[PDB]
Amino acid sequence: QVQLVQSGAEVKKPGSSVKVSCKASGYSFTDYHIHWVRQAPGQCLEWMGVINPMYGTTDYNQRFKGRVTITADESTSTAYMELSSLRSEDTAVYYCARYDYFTGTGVYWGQGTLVTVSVDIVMTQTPLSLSVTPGQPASISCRSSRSLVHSRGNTYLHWYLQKPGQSPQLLIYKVSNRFIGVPDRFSGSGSGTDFTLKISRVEAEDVGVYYCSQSTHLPFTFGCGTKLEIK
């Protein structure tokens, strides 16, 4: 089974450096890109960078240029993210995620590493939170600053659910494709810049934060999330 296991939580002073590990197993390590995404306390998801472990080639989010270094060790099947000159604004849960070109997005995520410091497409999610009567439907909207159409038949707009205390899990990829084991009560629609995730009947297991994500253009970007509650 594909697994990403990250190093433990870190408490750091401002100005220090942190290096987070991401140990991969269950697939050929060099055949997939490893991306790093952080979740700051305002719960928006911020893409930091990527490593192609076959060649050691990287790409970083400009906001972090000269501060982040992503490395990969093929002999240990481990990817690393080093963040230097830590500010209190860097307090966040750092995640590694394995990207593939069938979904076009991060499918397998590490459990996350809490680090406590003691040209972007804008993704707008609506509503900020909602509560639903058990068994009732729910609808979450995502609007992008520019078209997410990548090429003929390909729009890289995805929906994740982050259950409480868990990592984001992929529900829908490429607007309406349902990921493995995702029940048919989750359905995605839309085109260009306007998208919707519909839940036909909300179950107790559906509680959490839903995110839209685009991987049509670098830097990959996410919506700031929709908290769903049952009430």
PDB file of N, CA, C and O in Angstrom, residues 154-208:
ATOM      1  N   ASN A 154      -9.247  18.333 -20.446  1.00  0.00           N
ATOM      2  CA  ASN A 154      -8.485  18.338 -19.198  1.00  0.00           C
ATOM      3  C   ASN A 154      -8.592  19.629 -18.415  1.00  0.00           C
ATOM      4  O   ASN A 154      -7.959  20.615 -18.791  1.00  0.00           O
ATOM      5  N   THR A 155      -9.290  19.598 -17.260  1.00  0.00           N
ATOM      6  CA  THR A 155      -9.378  20.745 -16.361  1.00  0.00           C
ATOM      7  C   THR A 155      -8.892  20.245 -15.002  1.00  0.00           C
ATOM      8  O   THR A 155      -9.562  19.409 -14.410  1.00  0.00           O
ATOM      9  N   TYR A 156      -7.785  20.768 -14.484  1.00  0.00           N
ATOM     10  CA  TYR A 156      -7.235  20.235 -13.234  1.00  0.00           C
ATOM     11  C   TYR A 156      -7.767  20.954 -12.010  1.00  0.00           C
ATOM     12  O   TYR A 156      -7.076  21.767 -11.395  1.00  0.00           O
ATOM     13  N   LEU A 157      -9.055  20.709 -11.714  1.00  0.00           N
ATOM     14  CA  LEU A 157      -9.776  21.264 -10.583  1.00  0.00           C
ATOM     15  C   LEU A 157     -10.180  20.058  -9.723  1.00  0.00           C
ATOM     16  O   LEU A 157     -10.822  19.128 -10.213  1.00  0.00           O
ATOM     17  N   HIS A 158      -9.788  20.076  -8.446  1.00  0.00           N
ATOM     18  CA  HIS A 158     -10.000  18.924  -7.574  1.00  0.00           C
ATOM     19  C   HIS A 158     -10.658  19.311  -6.251  1.00  0.00           C
ATOM     20  O   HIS A 158     -10.637  20.472  -5.862  1.00  0.00           O
ATOM     21  N   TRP A 159     -11.246  18.317  -5.560  1.00  0.00           N
ATOM     22  CA  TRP A 159     -11.875  18.537  -4.267  1.00  0.00           C
ATOM     23  C   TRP A 159     -11.289  17.566  -3.264  1.00  0.00           C
ATOM     24  O   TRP A 159     -11.192  16.361  -3.537  1.00  0.00           O
ATOM     25  N   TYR A 160     -10.911  18.108  -2.106  1.00  0.00           N
ATOM     26  CA  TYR A 160     -10.358  17.323  -0.987  1.00  0.00           C
ATOM     27  C   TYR A 160     -11.257  17.475   0.203  1.00  0.00           C
ATOM     28  O   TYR A 160     -11.935  18.488   0.362  1.00  0.00           O
ATOM     29  N   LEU A 161     -11.181  16.509   1.091  1.00  0.00           N
ATOM     30  CA  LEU A 161     -11.817  16.591   2.382  1.00  0.00           C
ATOM     31  C   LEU A 161     -10.734  16.318   3.404  1.00  0.00           C
ATOM     32  O   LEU A 161     -10.018  15.315   3.296  1.00  0.00           O
ATOM     33  N   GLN A 162     -10.641  17.193   4.413  1.00  0.00           N
ATOM     34  CA  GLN A 162      -9.759  16.988   5.530  1.00  0.00           C
ATOM     35  C   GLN A 162     -10.659  16.700   6.739  1.00  0.00           C
ATOM     36  O   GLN A 162     -11.310  17.617   7.264  1.00  0.00           O
ATOM     37  N   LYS A 163     -10.771  15.410   7.106  1.00  0.00           N
ATOM     38  CA  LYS A 163     -11.555  14.989   8.272  1.00  0.00           C
ATOM     39  C   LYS A 163     -10.822  15.473   9.545  1.00  0.00           C
ATOM     40  O   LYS A 163      -9.601  15.719   9.491  1.00  0.00           O
ATOM     41  N   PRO A 164     -11.533  15.695  10.681  1.00  0.00           N
ATOM     42  CA  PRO A 164     -10.831  16.240  11.858  1.00  0.00           C
ATOM     43  C   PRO A 164      -9.679  15.349  12.327  1.00  0.00           C
ATOM     44  O   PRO A 164      -9.828  14.127  12.443  1.00  0.00           O
ATOM     45  N   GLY A 165      -8.522  15.971  12.498  1.00  0.00           N
ATOM     46  CA  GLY A 165      -7.304  15.303  12.927  1.00  0.00           C
ATOM     47  C   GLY A 165      -6.602  14.505  11.849  1.00  0.00           C
ATOM     48  O   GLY A 165      -5.624  13.815  12.142  1.00  0.00           O
ATOM     49  N   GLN A 166      -7.083  14.587  10.589  1.00  0.00           N
ATOM     50  CA  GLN A 166      -6.511  13.834   9.474  1.00  0.00           C
ATOM     51  C   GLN A 166      -5.851  14.731   8.404  1.00  0.00           C
ATOM     52  O   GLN A 166      -5.948  15.951   8.442  1.00  0.00           O
ATOM     53  N   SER A 167      -5.207  14.092   7.427  1.00  0.00           N
ATOM     54  CA  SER A 167      -4.589  14.746   6.278  1.00  0.00           C
ATOM     55  C   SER A 167      -5.680  14.987   5.216  1.00  0.00           C
ATOM     56  O   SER A 167      -6.676  14.236   5.205  1.00  0.00           O
ATOM     57  N   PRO A 168      -5.518  15.948   4.268  1.00  0.00           N
ATOM     58  CA  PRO A 168      -6.520  16.061   3.184  1.00  0.00           C
ATOM     59  C   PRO A 168      -6.589  14.743   2.403  1.00  0.00           C
ATOM     60  O   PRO A 168      -5.584  14.021   2.263  1.00  0.00           O
ATOM     61  N   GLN A 169      -7.787  14.348   2.026  1.00  0.00           N
ATOM     62  CA  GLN A 169      -7.961  13.165   1.193  1.00  0.00           C
ATOM     63  C   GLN A 169      -8.657  13.574  -0.079  1.00  0.00           C
ATOM     64  O   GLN A 169      -9.604  14.362  -0.042  1.00  0.00           O
ATOM     65  N   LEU A 170      -8.202  13.044  -1.192  1.00  0.00           N
ATOM     66  CA  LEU A 170      -8.796  13.352  -2.500  1.00  0.00           C
ATOM     67  C   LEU A 170     -10.189  12.711  -2.642  1.00  0.00           C
ATOM     68  O   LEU A 170     -10.341  11.504  -2.456  1.00  0.00           O
ATOM     69  N   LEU A 171     -11.179  13.526  -2.997  1.00  0.00           N
ATOM     70  CA  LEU A 171     -12.526  13.020  -3.263  1.00  0.00           C
ATOM     71  C   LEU A 171     -12.765  13.010  -4.754  1.00  0.00           C
ATOM     72  O   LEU A 171     -13.125  11.986  -5.315  1.00  0.00           O
ATOM     73  N   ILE A 172     -12.623  14.199  -5.385  1.00  0.00           N
ATOM     74  CA  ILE A 172     -12.921  14.377  -6.805  1.00  0.00           C
ATOM     75  C   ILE A 172     -11.698  14.950  -7.472  1.00  0.00           C
ATOM     76  O   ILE A 172     -11.144  15.912  -6.952  1.00  0.00           O
ATOM     77  N   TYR A 173     -11.347  14.447  -8.656  1.00  0.00           N
ATOM     78  CA  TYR A 173     -10.248  15.050  -9.413  1.00  0.00           C
ATOM     79  C   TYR A 173     -10.739  15.381 -10.791  1.00  0.00           C
ATOM     80  O   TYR A 173     -11.697  14.781 -11.273  1.00  0.00           O
ATOM     81  N   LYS A 174     -10.086  16.354 -11.416  1.00  0.00           N
ATOM     82  CA  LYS A 174     -10.415  16.773 -12.782  1.00  0.00           C
ATOM     83  C   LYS A 174     -11.923  17.058 -12.943  1.00  0.00           C
ATOM     84  O   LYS A 174     -12.603  16.509 -13.816  1.00  0.00           O
ATOM     85  N   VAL A 175     -12.441  17.900 -12.031  1.00  0.00           N
ATOM     86  CA  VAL A 175     -13.817  18.428 -11.977  1.00  0.00           C
ATOM     87  C   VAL A 175     -14.844  17.416 -11.498  1.00  0.00           C
ATOM     88  O   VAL A 175     -15.640  17.771 -10.636  1.00  0.00           O
ATOM     89  N   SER A 176     -14.894  16.194 -12.093  1.00  0.00           N
ATOM     90  CA  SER A 176     -15.966  15.264 -11.767  1.00  0.00           C
ATOM     91  C   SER A 176     -15.532  13.794 -11.635  1.00  0.00           C
ATOM     92  O   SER A 176     -16.385  12.926 -11.414  1.00  0.00           O
ATOM     93  N   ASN A 177     -14.235  13.510 -11.758  1.00  0.00           N
ATOM     94  CA  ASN A 177     -13.806  12.114 -11.587  1.00  0.00           C
ATOM     95  C   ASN A 177     -13.785  11.771 -10.120  1.00  0.00           C
ATOM     96  O   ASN A 177     -13.320  12.571  -9.334  1.00  0.00           O
ATOM     97  N   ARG A 178     -14.330  10.607  -9.744  1.00  0.00           N
ATOM     98  CA  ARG A 178     -14.373  10.197  -8.340  1.00  0.00           C
ATOM     99  C   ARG A 178     -13.197   9.279  -8.062  1.00  0.00           C
ATOM    100  O   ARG A 178     -12.942   8.357  -8.843  1.00  0.00           O
ATOM    101  N   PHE A 179     -12.432   9.583  -6.987  1.00  0.00           N
ATOM    102  CA  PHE A 179     -11.266   8.807  -6.594  1.00  0.00           C
ATOM    103  C   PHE A 179     -11.710   7.479  -5.952  1.00  0.00           C
ATOM    104  O   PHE A 179     -12.904   7.246  -5.751  1.00  0.00           O
ATOM    105  N   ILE A 180     -10.769   6.568  -5.741  1.00  0.00           N
ATOM    106  CA  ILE A 180     -11.026   5.219  -5.237  1.00  0.00           C
ATOM    107  C   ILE A 180     -11.785   5.233  -3.922  1.00  0.00           C
ATOM    108  O   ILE A 180     -11.427   5.988  -3.025  1.00  0.00           O
ATOM    109  N   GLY A 181     -12.865   4.455  -3.875  1.00  0.00           N
ATOM    110  CA  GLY A 181     -13.679   4.281  -2.680  1.00  0.00           C
ATOM    111  C   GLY A 181     -14.565   5.448  -2.338  1.00  0.00           C
ATOM    112  O   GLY A 181     -15.277   5.393  -1.333  1.00  0.00           O
ATOM    113  N   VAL A 182     -14.558   6.506  -3.186  1.00  0.00           N
ATOM    114  CA  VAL A 182     -15.373   7.695  -2.947  1.00  0.00           C
ATOM    115  C   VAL A 182     -16.798   7.362  -3.322  1.00  0.00           C
ATOM    116  O   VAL A 182     -17.042   7.135  -4.508  1.00  0.00           O
ATOM    117  N   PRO A 183     -17.766   7.432  -2.366  1.00  0.00           N
ATOM    118  CA  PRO A 183     -19.172   7.123  -2.727  1.00  0.00           C
ATOM    119  C   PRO A 183     -19.757   8.104  -3.727  1.00  0.00           C
ATOM    120  O   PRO A 183     -19.350   9.281  -3.784  1.00  0.00           O
ATOM    121  N   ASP A 184     -20.730   7.626  -4.516  1.00  0.00           N
ATOM    122  CA  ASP A 184     -21.417   8.399  -5.553  1.00  0.00           C
ATOM    123  C   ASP A 184     -22.214   9.587  -5.004  1.00  0.00           C
ATOM    124  O   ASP A 184     -22.628  10.433  -5.777  1.00  0.00           O
ATOM    125  N   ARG A 185     -22.394   9.685  -3.680  1.00  0.00           N
ATOM    126  CA  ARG A 185     -23.095  10.846  -3.124  1.00  0.00           C
ATOM    127  C   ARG A 185     -22.260  12.136  -3.279  1.00  0.00           C
ATOM    128  O   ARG A 185     -22.816  13.235  -3.264  1.00  0.00           O
ATOM    129  N   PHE A 186     -20.939  11.992  -3.522  1.00  0.00           N
ATOM    130  CA  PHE A 186     -20.050  13.140  -3.846  1.00  0.00           C
ATOM    131  C   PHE A 186     -20.032  13.320  -5.356  1.00  0.00           C
ATOM    132  O   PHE A 186     -19.757  12.356  -6.071  1.00  0.00           O
ATOM    133  N   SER A 187     -20.352  14.526  -5.841  1.00  0.00           N
ATOM    134  CA  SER A 187     -20.318  14.783  -7.273  1.00  0.00           C
ATOM    135  C   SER A 187     -19.769  16.180  -7.559  1.00  0.00           C
ATOM    136  O   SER A 187     -20.078  17.144  -6.860  1.00  0.00           O
ATOM    137  N   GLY A 188     -18.912  16.263  -8.555  1.00  0.00           N
ATOM    138  CA  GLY A 188     -18.309  17.531  -8.916  1.00  0.00           C
ATOM    139  C   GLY A 188     -18.787  17.994 -10.278  1.00  0.00           C
ATOM    140  O   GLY A 188     -18.987  17.184 -11.174  1.00  0.00           O
ATOM    141  N   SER A 189     -19.003  19.286 -10.434  1.00  0.00           N
ATOM    142  CA  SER A 189     -19.391  19.831 -11.734  1.00  0.00           C
ATOM    143  C   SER A 189     -18.730  21.198 -11.954  1.00  0.00           C
ATOM    144  O   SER A 189     -18.066  21.735 -11.056  1.00  0.00           O
ATOM    145  N   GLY A 190     -18.972  21.761 -13.132  1.00  0.00           N
ATOM    146  CA  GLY A 190     -18.504  23.085 -13.486  1.00  0.00           C
ATOM    147  C   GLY A 190     -17.549  23.117 -14.651  1.00  0.00           C
ATOM    148  O   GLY A 190     -17.261  22.087 -15.261  1.00  0.00           O
ATOM    149  N   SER A 191     -17.070  24.308 -14.984  1.00  0.00           N
ATOM    150  CA  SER A 191     -16.137  24.481 -16.098  1.00  0.00           C
ATOM    151  C   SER A 191     -15.512  25.841 -16.039  1.00  0.00           C
ATOM    152  O   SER A 191     -16.088  26.760 -15.450  1.00  0.00           O
ATOM    153  N   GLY A 192     -14.360  25.963 -16.689  1.00  0.00           N
ATOM    154  CA  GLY A 192     -13.618  27.209 -16.805  1.00  0.00           C
ATOM    155  C   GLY A 192     -13.144  27.740 -15.470  1.00  0.00           C
ATOM    156  O   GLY A 192     -12.091  27.337 -14.983  1.00  0.00           O
ATOM    157  N   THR A 193     -13.920  28.663 -14.897  1.00  0.00           N
ATOM    158  CA  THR A 193     -13.603  29.303 -13.628  1.00  0.00           C
ATOM    159  C   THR A 193     -14.639  29.025 -12.519  1.00  0.00           C
ATOM    160  O   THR A 193     -14.454  29.517 -11.409  1.00  0.00           O
ATOM    161  N   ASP A 194     -15.754  28.333 -12.806  1.00  0.00           N
ATOM    162  CA  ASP A 194     -16.774  28.140 -11.773  1.00  0.00           C
ATOM    163  C   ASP A 194     -17.140  26.673 -11.579  1.00  0.00           C
ATOM    164  O   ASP A 194     -17.608  26.005 -12.498  1.00  0.00           O
ATOM    165  N   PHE A 195     -16.938  26.192 -10.341  1.00  0.00           N
ATOM    166  CA  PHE A 195     -17.064  24.792  -9.945  1.00  0.00           C
ATOM    167  C   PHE A 195     -17.877  24.560  -8.694  1.00  0.00           C
ATOM    168  O   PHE A 195     -17.942  25.426  -7.832  1.00  0.00           O
ATOM    169  N   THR A 196     -18.467  23.370  -8.596  1.00  0.00           N
ATOM    170  CA  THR A 196     -19.292  22.994  -7.460  1.00  0.00           C
ATOM    171  C   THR A 196     -19.055  21.576  -7.046  1.00  0.00           C
ATOM    172  O   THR A 196     -19.063  20.666  -7.882  1.00  0.00           O
ATOM    173  N   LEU A 197     -18.989  21.379  -5.732  1.00  0.00           N
ATOM    174  CA  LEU A 197     -18.972  20.044  -5.150  1.00  0.00           C
ATOM    175  C   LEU A 197     -20.357  19.879  -4.497  1.00  0.00           C
ATOM    176  O   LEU A 197     -20.748  20.699  -3.674  1.00  0.00           O
ATOM    177  N   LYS A 198     -21.076  18.824  -4.863  1.00  0.00           N
ATOM    178  CA  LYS A 198     -22.368  18.505  -4.246  1.00  0.00           C
ATOM    179  C   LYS A 198     -22.280  17.209  -3.481  1.00  0.00           C
ATOM    180  O   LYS A 198     -21.667  16.248  -3.937  1.00  0.00           O
ATOM    181  N   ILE A 199     -22.883  17.184  -2.301  1.00  0.00           N
ATOM    182  CA  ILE A 199     -22.993  15.981  -1.473  1.00  0.00           C
ATOM    183  C   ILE A 199     -24.501  15.723  -1.428  1.00  0.00           C
ATOM    184  O   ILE A 199     -25.231  16.562  -0.928  1.00  0.00           O
ATOM    185  N   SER A 200     -24.972  14.640  -2.030  1.00  0.00           N
ATOM    186  CA  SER A 200     -26.410  14.410  -2.166  1.00  0.00           C
ATOM    187  C   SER A 200     -27.126  14.177  -0.835  1.00  0.00           C
ATOM    188  O   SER A 200     -28.245  14.664  -0.665  1.00  0.00           O
ATOM    189  N   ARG A 201     -26.482  13.452   0.094  1.00  0.00           N
ATOM    190  CA  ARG A 201     -27.014  13.136   1.423  1.00  0.00           C
ATOM    191  C   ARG A 201     -25.779  13.144   2.339  1.00  0.00           C
ATOM    192  O   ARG A 201     -24.871  12.341   2.116  1.00  0.00           O
ATOM    193  N   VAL A 202     -25.719  14.076   3.300  1.00  0.00           N
ATOM    194  CA  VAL A 202     -24.579  14.224   4.201  1.00  0.00           C
ATOM    195  C   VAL A 202     -24.678  13.231   5.364  1.00  0.00           C
ATOM    196  O   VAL A 202     -25.708  13.174   6.037  1.00  0.00           O
ATOM    197  N   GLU A 203     -23.624  12.414   5.532  1.00  0.00           N
ATOM    198  CA  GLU A 203     -23.465  11.395   6.595  1.00  0.00           C
ATOM    199  C   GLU A 203     -22.518  11.984   7.656  1.00  0.00           C
ATOM    200  O   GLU A 203     -21.776  12.943   7.368  1.00  0.00           O
ATOM    201  N   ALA A 204     -22.523  11.406   8.876  1.00  0.00           N
ATOM    202  CA  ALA A 204     -21.660  11.847   9.979  1.00  0.00           C
ATOM    203  C   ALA A 204     -20.173  11.795   9.582  1.00  0.00           C
ATOM    204  O   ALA A 204     -19.425  12.672   9.966  1.00  0.00           O
ATOM    205  N   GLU A 205     -19.775  10.801   8.778  1.00  0.00           N
ATOM    206  CA  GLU A 205     -18.398  10.643   8.336  1.00  0.00           C
ATOM    207  C   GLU A 205     -17.926  11.765   7.394  1.00  0.00           C
ATOM    208  O   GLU A 205     -16.723  11.880   7.196  1.00  0.00           O
ATOM    209  N   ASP A 206     -18.854  12.611   6.858  1.00  0.00           N
ATOM    210  CA  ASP A 206     -18.518  13.693   5.925  1.00  0.00           C
ATOM    211  C   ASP A 206     -18.044  15.011   6.553  1.00  0.00           C
ATOM    212  O   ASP A 206     -17.632  15.924   5.830  1.00  0.00           O
ATOM    213  N   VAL A 207     -18.113  15.124   7.879  1.00  0.00           N
ATOM    214  CA  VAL A 207     -17.710  16.298   8.642  1.00  0.00           C
ATOM    215  C   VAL A 207     -16.196  16.572   8.428  1.00  0.00           C
ATOM    216  O   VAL A 207     -15.390  15.650   8.393  1.00  0.00           O
ATOM    217  N   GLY A 208     -15.847  17.831   8.286  1.00  0.00           N
ATOM    218  CA  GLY A 208     -14.461  18.207   8.060  1.00  0.00           C
ATOM    219  C   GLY A 208     -14.367  19.456   7.229  1.00  0.00           C
ATOM    220  O   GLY A 208     -15.323  20.234   7.170  1.00  0.00           O
TER     221      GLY A 208
END
